[PDB]
Structures are given as C-alpha cells and as structure tokens.
UniProtKB/Swiss-Prot annotation, chain A:
Cofactor names: FMN; [4Fe-4S] cluster
Record disease entry: Mitochondrial complex I deficiency, nuclear type 4: A form of mitochondrial complex I deficiency, the most common biochemical signature of mitochondrial disorders, a group of highly heterogeneous conditions characterized by defective oxidative phosphorylation, which collectively affects 1 in 5-10000 live births. Clinical disorders have variable severity, ranging from lethal neonatal disease to adult-onset neurodegenerative disorders.
Binding site for NADH: G61, R62, G63, G64, A65, G66, F67, P68, T69, G70
Modified residues (N6-succinyllysine): K55
Free-text cofactor note: Binds 1 FMN. Binds 1 [4Fe-4S] cluster.
Gene behind this protein: NDUFV1
Compartmental location: Mitochondrion inner membrane
GO process terms (BP): aerobic respiration; mitochondrial ATP synthesis coupled electron transport; mitochondrial electron transport, NADH to ubiquinone; proton motive force-driven mitochondrial ATP synthesis
Gene Ontology molecular function: 4 iron, 4 sulfur cluster binding; FMN binding; metal ion binding; NAD binding; NADH dehydrogenase (ubiquinone) activity
Self-association and partners: Core subunit of respiratory chain NADH dehydrogenase (Complex I) which is composed of 45 different subunits. This is a component of the flavoprotein-sulfur (FP) fragment of the enzyme. Interacts with RAB5IF.
Name by which UniProt lists this protein: NADH dehydrogenase [ubiquinone] flavoprotein 1, mitochondrial
Enzyme Commission identifier(s): 7.1.1.2
Catalyzed reactions: a ubiquinone + NADH + 5 H(+)(in) = a ubiquinol + NAD(+) + 4 H(+)(out)
UniProt membrane topology term: Peripheral membrane protein
Swiss-Prot record, chain B:
Residue positions where N6-acetyllysine is found in the record: K37
Superkingdom to which the source organism belongs: Eukaryota
Location(s), subcellular: Mitochondrion inner membrane
Gene name of the encoded protein: NDUFA7
Protein name: NADH dehydrogenase [ubiquinone] 1 alpha subcomplex subunit 7
Assigned protein family: Belongs to the complex I NDUFA7 subunit family.
Oligomeric and partner information: Complex I is composed of 45 different subunits.
Annotated function: Accessory subunit of the mitochondrial membrane respiratory chain NADH dehydrogenase (Complex I), that is believed not to be involved in catalysis. Complex I functions in the transfer of electrons from NADH to the respiratory chain. The immediate electron acceptor for the enzyme is believed to be ubiquinone.
Region Disordered: start-end pairs: 29-48
Length: 431, 55
C-alpha cells in the first residue's frame, strides 16, 4: 500500500465478483450479490455529492487516457440548454492486448448497467447509449437479454427502479471500426457519419451526437462508479499511490505459462504478477527482455527498467510509458522483435482511416520503412530517419492513433538500435 | 624535323625547342575516359536536413 509491499489484494476489495463467470451472470446472480443494494437511494435528485464522491475517489481515466473521470464528468453539471443530454459508453474492445472488457460484459453486465444508471443520472442524461462491436454480435445479444431483464423488473425504463428519474439505455453497434475505439470517432459513428474523429475547437461536452450535448466514459470507470457512490470512494482512493488511486485490470498475455486478466492494486511491481498470476514465462523469467505495458501502443520496456516499475501508470511514465489501459503483452527473447513491431505498425496502417494527412501518410510510409528494416535490406542510418518521421507524426496528428502508431518503434530504436545494426550486418554479409 | 635543321633552328633560337614541344604530338590525353561518379554532396544525409539551418 503506502509501503513498498505490493501484490496484496483482498477478494472483497474487488468491486468485481463474477469476473470469471461463476455465480451466475444472470440478474438473479446480481441479486445474490445484492447489487441493487441502495441503488434507488443513490438517486437523491442532485449530482454533486456523488460527483464529488467520484472526485474524492481519486479515480482517473480507464480508457488508458488516465484522465480524472470525476473532473471529466463534472462537465455536465451544466444546464441542458434545451437539447437532451446523453451518455455514451465506450465498449469498442478492439484494442490489442485488451480482453478485459470482454469477459466482464460476458459475466457481469449488471454492475455496468447500474453504472449507466448512476453515471447517466450524474450527467442528467436523457438516455444511456452504448456501443458494441460487429465482431460482438452474440455478446450484444447477451447484454440485450440482461438489459431486458432490467426492463421487466422496471429497474430501468420509466422512472427506473423508483426515484422517478426516467432512464432508457440504447444499445448500439458498429462494423470493423476500430477507430471508433477513439471516443469522438464513435460519437461520429452514432450519427451515421463515418468514424473519422472531429477536431475540437469545441469539446464533445460542448456538442455531442446530433448536435445535442453528450458525454463518454470507458466501461471500467462507469461500471465502478455506482460502487464509488455507495461504498466510500475514499476507500477506493486508499489503494496504490495517491494519483494512482484504486485498482486496474492486468491483462498478462503473450508468451507466459498462464496468461490471464487480474484486477489488482494499481501499484504492484510489474514482475510480481508475472511471477504470481501469470505463473512465470516458459523457460523462466530470465528469458524476458521485452514486455510491453499498455495495449500494444505504449513504448517497450526492457527487463532492467521492468524490475523496478510498478503497474500504476506514473511508474510507467518514469519508464517513459503511457497507461494504455494497462494491457500487458509479454515477449520472449527467442522470437525476433522487429517483425512484431512491424506487424503492429502494419496493424496501424490497416486501421487509421486517414483524415488528417500527417498520420495517414506517416503510417503508410513508416510501415514500408519497417518492411525494409525487417527484410534487413536497409542501411543502418535509415532508422534514425524514421525517428524524424515520428517527430512529425506526434503533436501533429489530429488523434492519438498516430501516437501509439509511432511509439513502439521509437522504443525499438532507443533500445534495440544495436540489435538493428546487428541484423543489418548479417544481410550485409550475404555477398 | 631533321636533326641538323633542329640544331640550326635551336641555334638561332637561343633556346631548345625540343625541350618544350610547340606543336602538340603524341602525348595529348585520351578522349574516351571511365565515368566520373561525382562527389556525393555534403547534405544528402538522411538523419537531418531541416531547412532551418542550411538556409
Ligand atoms: C475500448 C476503447 C478503445 C479506445 N480506442 C482508442 C483509440 O484507438 N485511439 C484513441 O486515441 N483513443 C482510444 N480510446 C480512448 C478514447 O479516446 C476516449 O478518450 C476514452 O474512451 C475515454 O476514457 P474515459 O472513459 O476513461 O474518460 C479508447 C477507449 C476505449 C474505452
Ligand atoms: S489522425 Fe490519422 S488516425 Fe487519428 S484520426 Fe486523424 S486520421 Fe484517423
């Protein structure tokens, strides 16, 4: 906690039971969990103290942005302006390294629904819009069923479980739009407009879907929120480092004996969960040289800095790493890395639409440059030029897809430069 | 080009002329020469080339 000791976490500290599907994801199972607890009484017809409960919660963005969600949601204490206000929930779950939002929807829709109700009330929202993947059809039906169970019970619909605050959710789906993983792209998806994100002289808070003001939040934040509004949010604020208050899902993945998702205290050492929840990588931890924090977006972490870093994102920032929804992809040393990062940047090129020029062209270009690198044909100096490209991508691109498009190879330069040159020399020797 | 005539010529000359051939004979230089390749140019480095400095 306050001490260097970490890896500790009580099961009842978890907001999320039935994380793994046991004990009935059905609404009856939510009742066994007593999830509706004081949910009607939370609706005292005035945000503030719940909104302040979240401000005091220490809670920040679970979209990987890490942005203080209490302040983010503070924005819609504003008068409705006569245009109906909505809350849009981000359920894209297209991001790599991220299976976290999948099993929760598969096994615990209800806490999220209560989150739509509480947070939707906090916004004064007319409704509760929720995106779904087109890859996510069957799951959309599961959630539609649980939501129907919420209707029949009257827990939603008109007045919604008493209190008299009208509340209708609206399930929404897309098709192949990974960029709608970006929030404003999804807000654009709602109008039937293509999911190419807006520039923001006005923020989404100022203007939302259909011109009527809206708001957005990641599934994790909005799902934890009702429990923040019930169980003390200060109790949530107690875990981890102060700025890193609360808990985060840890999706250990890739080459390891037991890859898994484990919600956990924000600031456990990164090696610990590998040695614990992950069961350790095959061939032992010693093989590790490259394991990436974040959803295949943030820069790579070498084992030396890896031993020191705590899972909370600030420790990552000192490791020069973003939050990235704290997804974790382990990468064993025996495999080549450059092919992997090239495959990743390829993943960006397939998915970046291409509205503003610098990122479209920047990725379309940097990809081919990576092909030249991986083939080994490339001259050693060329890689440095790629760095220049990165510099022209970052603060210029209208959206952060380009940022994560740029970073991993920046890390591959910064650490694996000698490795790169070593690879090039072998191609040099063929003649 | 006869040698006695060379002697009498250089005689009147006050100078050897054979020592500095006046009419350009065999030596000249070859017309057909192997390709120049040319200097690469100082600023064709790719790592940096911002106009802000070279300007
Ligand atoms: C499932 C999911 C996918 C996302 N994908 C992207 C993305 O590809 N690019 C991006 O810039 N932001 C992405 N975001 C973050 C959004 O830009 C937006 O700021 C975020 O969803 C809101 O975070 P919050 O709810 O924690 O405030 C994603 C967020 C979520 C929840
Ligand atoms: S920047 Fe490139 S990626 Fe981000 S939105 Fe504009 S086009 Fe799509």
């Amino acid at each position: 906690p306050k001490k260097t000791s970490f890896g500790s976490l009580k099961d009842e500290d978890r907001i999320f039971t039935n994380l793994y599907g046991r004990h009935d994801w059905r609404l009856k199972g939510s009742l066994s969990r007593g999830d509706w607890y004081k949910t009607k009484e939370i609706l005292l017809k005035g945000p503030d103290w719940i909104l302040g409960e979240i401000k005091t919660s220490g809670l920040r963005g679970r979209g990987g942005a890490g942005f203080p969600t209490g302040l983010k949601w503070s924005f819609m204490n504003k008068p409705s302006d006569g245009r109906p206000k909505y809350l849009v929930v981000n359920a894209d779950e297209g991001e790599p390294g991220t299976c976290k939002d999948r099993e929760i929807l598969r096994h615990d829709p209800h806490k999220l629904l209560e989150g739509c109700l509480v947070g939707g009330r906090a916004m004064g929202a007319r409704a509760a819009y929720i995106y779904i993947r087109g890859e996510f059809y069957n799951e959309a039906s599961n959630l539609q069923v649980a939501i129907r169970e919420a209707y029949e019970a009257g827990l939603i619909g008109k007045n919604a479980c008493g209190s008299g605050y009208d509340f209708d959710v609206f399930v929404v789906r897309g098709a192949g739009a990974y960029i709608c993983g970006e929030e404003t792209a999804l807000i654009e998806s709602i109008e039937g407009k293509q999911g190419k994100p807006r520039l923001k002289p006005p923020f989404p808070a100022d203007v939302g879907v259909f011109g009527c003001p809206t708001t957005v939040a990641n599934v994790e934040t909005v799902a934890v929120s009702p429990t923040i509004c019930r169980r003390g949010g200060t109790w949530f604020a107690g875990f981890g480092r102060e700025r890193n208050s609360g808990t985060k899902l840890f999706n250990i993945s890739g080459h390891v004996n037991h890859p898994c998702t484990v919600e956990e205290e924000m600031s456990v050492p990164l090696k610990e969960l590998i040695e614990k929840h992950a069961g350790g990588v095959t061939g032992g931890w010693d093989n590790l040289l490259a394991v990436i924090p974040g959803g295949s977006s943030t820069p790579l972490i070498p084992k030396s800095v890896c031993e020191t870093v705590l899972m909370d994102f600030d420790a990552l920032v000192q490791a020069q790493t973003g939050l990235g929804t704290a997804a974790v992809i382990v990468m064993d040393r025996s495999t080549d890395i450059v092919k992997a990062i090239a495959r990743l940047i390829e993943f960006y090129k397939h998915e970046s639409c291409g509205q503003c020029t610098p990122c479209r062209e920047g990725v379309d270009w940097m990809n081919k440059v990576m092909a030249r690198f991986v083939r080994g044909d490339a001259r050693p100096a060329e890689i440095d030029s790629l760095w220049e490209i990165s510099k022209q991508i970052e603060g210029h691109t209208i959206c952060a897809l380009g940022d994560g498009a740029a970073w991993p190879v920046q890390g591959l330069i910064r650490h694996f430069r000698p490795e790169l040159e070593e690879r090039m020399q072998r191609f040099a020797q063929q003649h | 080009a006869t040698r006695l005539i060379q002697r009498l010529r250089n005689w009147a000359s006050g100078h050897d002329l054979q020592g500095k051939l006046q009419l350009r004979y065999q030596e000249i230089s070859k017309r057909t020469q192997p390709p120049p390749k040319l200097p690469v140019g100082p600023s064709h480095k790719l790592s940096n080339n911002y106009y802000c400095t070279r300007d």
